[PDB]
Amino acid sequence: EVQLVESGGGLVQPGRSLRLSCAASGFTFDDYAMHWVRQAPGKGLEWVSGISWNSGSIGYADSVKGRFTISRDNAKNSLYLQMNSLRAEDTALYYCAKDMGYSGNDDYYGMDVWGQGTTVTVSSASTKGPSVFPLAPSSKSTSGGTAALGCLVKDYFPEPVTVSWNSGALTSGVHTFPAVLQSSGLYSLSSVVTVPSSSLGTQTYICNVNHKPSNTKVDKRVEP
């Protein structure tokens, strides 16, 4: 019944603003204080901003103090966050949360309800699609150690790249790694699947990368 629903997000360049919002349902919106919290990949929770009931008090984190503005609309039961002059350092998941109390001055309680945070990425890059560079197995030296074959997915900007083998037919022995951001602003991902070395000369292995944002699908063969 009680839930918070976030809206907004997307991929933007630095020097631009982005507005986030959160809808309240299942509870009275104006009986509680509201907060925004963000979490970057590999990092813990970081508080961003918050506001008390009837806007008695407003606070901001030092890192965004001169850039972010928080406001509320009780009539529409909604919370808003205006982020101006975004920087690459502001890349994170952004969540809205409901405080147990109606004021930040109450140090006995924590946050009661968390919503489903959205993704905000700040980078000077276009939504470039991935390229695939297949990694042949070292069948000459690993034949008795089980054969490991893989591929690299490179030079793509957006996060949500789907990688599978043999069009999803091959999931067993598959190890797909988290993408790592390059200094170019583009991501690079690796994927390897382990198979019996005897299968190398009988089974064709295809690295399949599906990237919706660029309408791009890349099929590469991986062989000794």
């Binding site: 813990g44 929770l45 508080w47 930040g104 009661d112 297949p134 490991a148 790694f177 790592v180 690796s190």
Partner: protein, 211 residues
């Protein structure tokens, strides 16, 4: 500016074991600490507030305690569902709530060596003016695996990146992929490449190489 200190990294424990997470502020912030739990892909949830008050819907397994300025979260009997990252937060009587980085609970397993594979650069990459070689560690139990790159029998660093998967849901293992980036011209000038793997499950370091 008062920051919170949490457990150094993570706690390795089996199901049915005892897990304790401790947090302390560098300076006094408040009389109460709030504890949160987070799972991958999910928003964090409150377990304990007011130091000792358990949140409704939360099982008795989680119990607040402490000594001096050190706050503790105790799990009396660890369950399969209790493997998560836990966070410590204090309000400082202001809207500017302060969060820690959190403490992770890992599944305890017997330590064993990784399988090691090397993946030399493709022809398509060299034709593109670049080169990339990957060292792979499969099915090892510890998270803290170490991989070093060597070129022409010389140690290299600062030109490579590490990516590691989440602990496996069935085998409770990790997989590591270390990538070394070279240009076409700089890749070609070298004669031999090698990769050195150091691991707690190894009685001795293992080196792989290619030309």
């Amino acid at each position: 500016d008062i920051q919170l200190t949490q457990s150094p990294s993570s706690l390795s424990a089996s199901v049915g074991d005892r897990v304790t997470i401790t947090c302390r502020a560098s300076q006094r912030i408040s009389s109460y600490l709030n504890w949160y739990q987070q799972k991958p892909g999910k928003a964090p949830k409150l377990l304990i507030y007011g130091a000792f008050s358990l949140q409704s819907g939360v099982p008795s397994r989680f119990s607040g305690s402490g000594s001096g300025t050190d706050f503790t979260l105790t799990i009396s009997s660890l369950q399969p569902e209790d493997f998560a990252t836990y966070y410590c937060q204090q309000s400082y009587r202001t809207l500017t709530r302060t969060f820690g980085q959190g403490t992770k609970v890992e599944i305890k397993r017997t330590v064993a060596a990784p399988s090691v594979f090397i993946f030399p650069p493709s022809d398509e990459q060299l034709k593109s003016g670049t080169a990339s070689v990957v060292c792979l560690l499969n099915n090892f139990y510890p998270r803290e695996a170490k991989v070093q790159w060597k070129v022409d029998n010389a140690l290299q660093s600062g030109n490579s990146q590490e990516s590691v998967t989440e602990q496996d849901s069935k085998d409770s293992t990790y997989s590591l992929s270390s990538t070394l980036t070279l240009s076409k011209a700089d890749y070609e000038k070298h004669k031999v490449y090698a990769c050195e793997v150091t691991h707690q499950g190894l009685s001795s370091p293992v080196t792989k190489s290619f030309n």
